[PDB]
């Protein structure tokens, strides 16, 4: 859990600065880009390694620290706490293969759902691929919610985290019986035509990507796989999804279709496939920026001398040599 609420923000963000440019980030660089407190961040790092926040690396010459799976996760929740969306943790967790679903609660007590991307090449690239995944998923989630679709409501995105509306139900794959099979079938068939009207094909529109809300309402999740209708094989992915639903309701619920929708409508809706002259006050601002940069560069070099680990290794062997003489 999150007890520590000051220095842990600045140090962990400084890791993320080095993670975007380089692999394993040395402890010398950290203190320079976290200039607010000097010297005492090395004991914070020793508290970070107690948790699954950072990992140590001392290979051959490469000495420093890299950010972990769980350590990257804490940074998003710390940002979402400042945006007043997350406060306490709900325990119902659906541990998946591509992502983890965590129930969150705000100041109000209103329960929302949180997605955390767990893509698993070094861990540096893996925690950058999860960054692009959340930004892409939130883009479609905003695009569909605005265009009348029955999707979870987008709230906030932070690096790899996506806060969505809490739609609680069961996935279609583990459903025994539906009270009204025909009305549910026609609802689902409409949604393929709906997407095709907006110039989109789901691609993998199966029973593994559909959730029933009280056996009345079909909910759609997971959107990184989506393709344009400008694609040469546009009608193939359209017909494969139709046949997947046609056979499933005939298999599980024994409902045969009276309606066979094969309409190509592109596009009647929004194309979502794309988805003395200088005043003294300015002189002050400009002189200030110069003076801050001179001090910041000097503080970097003071912090780069922290090597403290190099001095500790050299001292241990000298004591052994003198005693043996």
């Amino acid at each position: 859990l999150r007890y520590m609420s000051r220095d842990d923000f600045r140090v962990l963000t400084a890791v993320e600065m080095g993670m975007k440019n380089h692999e394993i980030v040395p402890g010398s660089l950290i203190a320079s880009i976290a200039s607010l407190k000097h010297g005492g961040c090395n004991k914070v790092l020793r508290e970070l390694v107690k948790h699954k926040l950072i990992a140590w690396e001392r290979t051959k010459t490469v000495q420093g620290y890299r950010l972990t799976n769980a350590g990257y996760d804490y940074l998003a929740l710390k940002t979402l706490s400042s945006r007043q969306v997350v406060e306490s943790v709900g325990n119902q967790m659906g541990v998946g293969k591509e992502s983890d679903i965590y129930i969150v609660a705000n100041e109000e007590g209103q329960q929302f759902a949180l997605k955390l991307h767990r893509l698993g090449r070094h861990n540096v690239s893996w925690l950058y691929l999860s960054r692009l995944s959340a930004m892409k998923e939130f883009a479609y989630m905003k695009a569909l919610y605005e265009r009348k679709f029955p999707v979870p409501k987008p709230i906030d995105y932070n690096r790899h985290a996506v806060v969505m509306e809490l739609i609680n139900g069961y996935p279609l794959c583990q459903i025994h019986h539906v009270e009204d099979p025909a009305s549910v079938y026609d609802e689902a068939m409409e949604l393929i035509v709906k997407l095709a009207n907006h110039g989109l094909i789901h691609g993998d529109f199966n029973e593994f990507n559909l959730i029933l809300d009280e056996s009345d309402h079909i909910t759609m999740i997971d959107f990184p796989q989506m393709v344009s209708t400008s694609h040469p094989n546009a009608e193939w992915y359209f017909d494969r999804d139709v046949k997947c639903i046609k056979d499933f309701f005939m298999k599980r619920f024994s409902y045969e279709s009276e309606l066979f929708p094969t309409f190509k409508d592109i596009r009647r809706e929004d194309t979502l496939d794309v988805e003395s002259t200088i005043p003294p006050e300015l002189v002050k601002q400009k002189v200030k920026r110069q003076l801050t940069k001179q001090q910041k560069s000097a503080v970097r070099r003071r912090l780069q001398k922290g090597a403290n680990i190099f001095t500790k290794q050299r001292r241990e062997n000298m004591q052994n040599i003198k005693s043996s003489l």
């Binding site: 325990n91 119902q92 967790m93 541990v95 965590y102």
Partner: protein, 120 residues
């Protein structure tokens, strides 16, 4: 009430042997295994409360730690708390449940009502 074609009249006056041939498969094992020095002492303390009862009272509840004991037909009506691990319960001995054990009426666990799934 009638158990195995034998009324509650005959069940009390029979021999100890003759009750076996009415019992179930697991129950005929144990009386030929023999009731032990502690379980000879639990059927004797139940003869006291029923006899010292007021005759309009079914007797006082007498505590015990022998869950596994069968209900013999002379135990019928004997209020006995049977222990679960934590604290006693109340089990009215009906004649309808002689073939069962005392342990199954002292319910061990509180049944699970789920709270929301946490961080999984």
């Amino acid at each position: 009430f009638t158990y195995r074609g034998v009324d509650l009249d005959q069940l009390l006056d029979m021999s100890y042997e003759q009750l076996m041939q009415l019992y179930s498969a697991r129950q005929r094992r144990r009386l030929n295994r023999g009731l032990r020095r502690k379980q000879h002492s639990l059927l004797k303390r139940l003869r006291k409360a029923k006899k010292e009862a007021p005759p309009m009272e079914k007797p006082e509840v007498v505590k015990t730690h022998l869950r596994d004991m069968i209900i013999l037909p002379e135990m019928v009506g004997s209020m006995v708390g049977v222990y679960n691990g934590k604290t006693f319960n109340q089990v009215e001995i009906k004649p309808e449940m002689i073939g069962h054990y005392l342990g199954e009426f002292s319910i061990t666990y509180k049944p699970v009502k789920h709270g929301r799934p946490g961080i999984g």
